[PDB]
């Protein structure tokens, strides 16, 4: 992608996350777990849906049509009819091909973006109590039980509480 | 039966923006194109699990 997160520094996807597009896996004293993140999953979904509807909306062509097939050779007028229709068809084919390409490149870049944003957000929350391992995982330098992990996932995590423990653990 | 779009091959559904069936049509009908398939990605890039 453009942000190099998905198929980026994030090694691979989790096929076992059936409840969302993005999420957290964690490891702590209690065990390990995997949970989806609704807010970003829905961000991406909403965008892609909006896009989809923009593409399939009111795209139908309605007006009276000339004769597009001919039994007997004629001359000028028919040569012209055919030419008009061929030109039309080529232009529309091109429009379609281009549309699909731009759209798809964008869809990929945008999803990449969402992943990366969720990541930067998490990090900013963790403040100085964690380090960025580089694979999309954070090392948390204090004991963090399940409640605390959830507190990070739901945005209420208060770093000042664990700051001393964490710093102490990082720098010695 | 009910179909808004009619071609000489018979009726086609107009849900999609484009159609490869016939350049001759009647009714609200997708724009006719030369391509028989164009896939629009509705999800992220797929990166299967290593193993």
């Amino acid at each position, epitope marked *: 992608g453009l942000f190099g997160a998905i198929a980026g520094f994030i090694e691979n996807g*989790w096929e076992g996350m059936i*409840d969302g597009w993005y999420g957290f896996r964690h490891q702590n004293s209690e065990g*390990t*777990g995997q*949970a*989806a993140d609704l807010k970003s999953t829905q961000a991406a979904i909403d965008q892609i849906n909006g896009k989809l509807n923009r593409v399939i909306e009111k795209t139908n062509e309605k007006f009276h049509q000339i004769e597009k097939e001919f039994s007997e050779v004629e001359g000028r007028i028919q040569d012209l009819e055919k030419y008009v229709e061929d030109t039309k068809i080529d232009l529309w084919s091109y429009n379609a091909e281009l549309l699909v390409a731009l759209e798809n490149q964008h869809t990929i870049d945008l999803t990449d973006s969402e992943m990366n944003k969720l990541f930067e957000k998490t990090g900013r929350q963790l403040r100085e109590n964690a380090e960025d391992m580089g694979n999309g995982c954070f090392k948390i330098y204090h004991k963090c039980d*399940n409640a605390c992990i959830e507190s990070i996932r739901n945005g209420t995590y208060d770093h000042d509480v664990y700051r001393d423990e964490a710093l102490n653990n990082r720098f010695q | 039966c009910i179909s808004e779009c009619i071609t000489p091959n018979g009726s086609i559904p107009n849900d999609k923006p484009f159609q490869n069936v016939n350049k001759i049509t009647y009714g609200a009908c997708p724009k006719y194109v030369k391509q028989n398939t164009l896939k629009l990605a509705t999800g992220m890039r797929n990166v299967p699990e290593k193993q």
Partner: antibody
Amino acid sequence: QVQLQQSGAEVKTPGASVKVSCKASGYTFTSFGVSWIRQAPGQGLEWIGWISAYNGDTYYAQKFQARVTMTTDTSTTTAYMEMRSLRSDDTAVYYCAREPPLFYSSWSLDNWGQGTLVTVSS
Amino acid sequence: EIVMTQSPGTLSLSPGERATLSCRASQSVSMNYLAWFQQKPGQAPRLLIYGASRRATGIPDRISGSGSGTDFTLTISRLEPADFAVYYCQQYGTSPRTFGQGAKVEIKR
């Protein structure tokens, strides 16, 4: 179509053993866990346990801690459940259901095998 | 261990009416990880709801979960002949995972 295919009905006498099989197909087998759940005739559901086909982790209900062991075989994409020292009240239908690859995950038992009836009688 | 309690154990309702099933938990269900399953006679359970409000894929808008902490509800807005069946709740919050026992919906006649 994400199918879990369970072995045939069993009939065992008290004191014996049983090993039940579940052949998964239609998904990447090592991306999930499998959880075993039994139901006695005209009764409710009781969770036996959970195993990760991913990291090999294991969680057993205290009750079956002793008599049960869960395994998986990745080459056959197959999960097994072995119960030892059978009593007659172990008579039930045993279901194998797909679960998250890690224990403390956020969804549950989304796909169910057809179940296999184990009858313990003398 | 956590004690799942469903009430009432049986509902008699007519197709088109709304069924409301209750699940209380002895203590707070961690994370609100609570699932509803449906079982018809002879078949295996189906996953209806997980995460307490979230529909498993392939499931109608008429079937919906609600509630939190200790108190949860499963609602069916318009009863169709395929909805008469037994329903179980389970809490996957902690080990051991535990189910309530058998709330059965049936046709009033």
